[PDB]
Protein: Putative glutathione transferase
Organism: Sphingobium chlorophenolicum
Amino acid sequence: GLLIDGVWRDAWYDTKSSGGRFVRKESQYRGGLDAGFRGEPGRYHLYAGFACPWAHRVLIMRALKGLEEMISVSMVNAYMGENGWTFLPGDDVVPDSINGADYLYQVYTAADPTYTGRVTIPILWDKVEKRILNNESSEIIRILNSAFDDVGALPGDYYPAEFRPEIDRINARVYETLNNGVYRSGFATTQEAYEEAFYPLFDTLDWLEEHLTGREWLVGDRLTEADIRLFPTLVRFDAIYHGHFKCNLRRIADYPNLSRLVGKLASHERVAPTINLRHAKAHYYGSHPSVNPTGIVPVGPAQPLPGLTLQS
Amino acid sequence: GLLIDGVWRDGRFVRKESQYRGGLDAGFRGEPGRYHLYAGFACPWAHRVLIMRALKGLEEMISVSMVNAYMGENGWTFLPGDDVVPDSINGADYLYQVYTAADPTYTGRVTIPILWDKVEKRILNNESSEIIRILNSAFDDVGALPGDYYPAEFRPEIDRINARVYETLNNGVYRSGFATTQEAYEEAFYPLFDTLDWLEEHLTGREWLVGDRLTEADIRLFPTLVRFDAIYHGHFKCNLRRIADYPNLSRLVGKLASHERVAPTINLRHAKAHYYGSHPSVNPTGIVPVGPAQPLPGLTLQS
């Protein structure tokens, strides 16, 4: 599925070709973010969902800063079919208020009628300028972390200047080999590609587990955006990735230090309500017929996580 | 595909059950070098007879041919393919050709294991549950290492555990895996896990399932367990929890898999390839995970 000229096309990219006509696949809305800077209660609207681990990132930052009443939300259906992400009735759906769209693609198009590109979440929508402010997770996270600080946000700097270099090092490997790793693996079409993705993925877990040995968080001893982008992948791992995406060299459950980080975070009031594994499980098994044609959702692993029990 | 008249095809009514229930009577016979065994490293059914052949020390009185891991549009095949040995009897390419050599008008499923009488140039028995009983005895006069895995004194217990284990485990992984509707899926393995539970409780205290004998109930059962965490858990969505999660089942798996004689019949690498490569309906990408690195924890059982 792409938006081709404001028209929704589940048919190639397309007939001609690369080209023919070239289609930009990156996040095309990189606003917010600039010099100075940042915003306003009641002004911005978050589009997101429970399946996407990229959207999860912004949900976790929206909670951690307590922007839940300053930044409203709409939440899409777990089934991604002919029309892609949709707001049709269903588990955990929260409708497109202001715009009343049936399909996520209609949000992009409401703003720019000929839009050509992918139609993704999360989207930070500027309600006043009636358009997308920015729709790249990594970026939004930062937008939400810096100044709403000004206007009632809970204190919290998850990108400490003192540490940006190290955070950066980690976000990069984690992004490339893990965040996007589980997808490169699950969607790979040749065995070689599957192995060439899957193995670096575990090399990265093997590394993260060491780093975490006498630590509580990835960087210094502070929850930071490093963990916040690692956690969405972990939380879905054993319960979705390990099976569906074949990431099964071992379980996150088999990495004591990581399993501990996941428990810590899945136990935080605030983060906990942003998790909905039933929904993710359903979106992943039920929306990828290339990989899982019956669409049947495994009776899952029963109890894919832990709690928090190794203090003193 | 079926052997229809045959005529290999991907109106007649084919019969599901295996059709050659030979052997089995009063007399045996069980001469050395007379019988040929057609199996493979992937198929659990086959694995039963591979084990019973290895336990009764009959691996030289009974020659094997070992099918190729990829079940294609032709079926089990002997093509030079990776993991094993060809048909020294009819130099056949496809397993179906074996069936056909004996009965050029055969109608049935083309399956393994097979007990072939090299002399009558026909199929004796092609039924796992039966083949193991033949091997367990009819050779004892002629050289079999002593063993009785269907000891008369227990046939009732053995027979009853077998029934449950068959219809909901042995056969349950498959039914849950090829189930095509969430509803059917759940109808199949919720009750399969029920049996793992039953089996776990039941195996508490015991070292084997029946008698303190390693018995055929254990051989019928090992093949499903040993493939379970590597293939079934993943590929057939049998994932409620691992066999690693059941301590006594694990105890039993280790105990058997480390048994010399038995260990040599286990090729999980081959198994994985076959399941993940041969069920496009279940796993169309054909990729074979990697996955899990140590399926069955090693071996350490004692006081």
Notes: The beta strands of chain B are 2-3, 8-9, 35-39, 62-66, 108-109, 114-117, 122-125. The domain at 148-258 of chain B is CATH 1.20.1050.10 (Glutathione S-transferase Yfyf (Class Pi); Chain A, domain 2). The first strand of chain B starts at residue 2 and ends at 3.
